[PDB]
């Protein structure tokens, strides 16, 4: 049970436009440059493989994400909103990891928080596993033709005041 797309046609069907789309997509699949986002057990792959939190759209979540980590994480995804996605690289960004049963202050994966393309085996693999992961992400972006620049905003809101009781 899914929805239905539009799927009318491909308007940019010239040789120059598809050539520019293929070159821009392959160069987009070539220039990863992550924000690192370590600060956990998956930081150890950074020494083997910026600082502006709105710059690098191609970030992979290489960290153990918790419930208190989640508001800053969704704010950081709001700081990377439209172009690119994230790559889960810790079983705790996938299933909650080794504490998937009984942990209260740890989210069971960021697959209920953020769109994730690639799921890793999780606990720090070999340093070429991240290379194979970004290669498979490059193959994923190479499949993408920038969606033919097709855009929709929901904007659900109530202007009735809540029954508030602050401190």
């Amino acid at each position: 049970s899914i929805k239905f797309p539009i799927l009318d046609r491909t308007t940019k069907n010239s040789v120059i436009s598809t050539t520019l789309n293929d070159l821009s997509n392959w160069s987009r699949l070539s220039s990863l440059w992550p924000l690192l986002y370590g600060t956990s057990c998956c930081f150890i792959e950074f020494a083997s493989l910026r600082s502006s939190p709105r710059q690098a759209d191609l970030i992979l979540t290489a960290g153990t994400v918790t419930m208190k980590m989640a508001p800053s994480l969704v704010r950081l995804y709001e700081q990377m909103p439209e172009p690119k996605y994230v790559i889960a690289m810790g079983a705790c960004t996938i299933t909650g990891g080794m504490f998937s049963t009984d942990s209260y202050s740890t989210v069971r994966g960021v697959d209920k928080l953020i769109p994730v393309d690639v799921y890793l085996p999780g606990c720090p693999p070999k340093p070429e596993a991240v290379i194979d992961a970004i290669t498979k992400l490059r193959k994923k972006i190479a499949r993408e033709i920038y969606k033919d620049r097709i855009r929709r905003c929901f904007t659900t809101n109530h202007k009735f005041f809540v029954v508030r009781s602050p401190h």
Binding site: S1, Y85, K112, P115, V116, E144, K147
Partner: peptide, 13 residues
């Protein structure tokens, strides 16, 4: 609520 299959993931959450 059906699914979408219009995003680039569609992970069936």
């Amino acid at each position: 609520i059906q699914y979408n299959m219009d995003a680039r993931v569609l992970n069936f959450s």
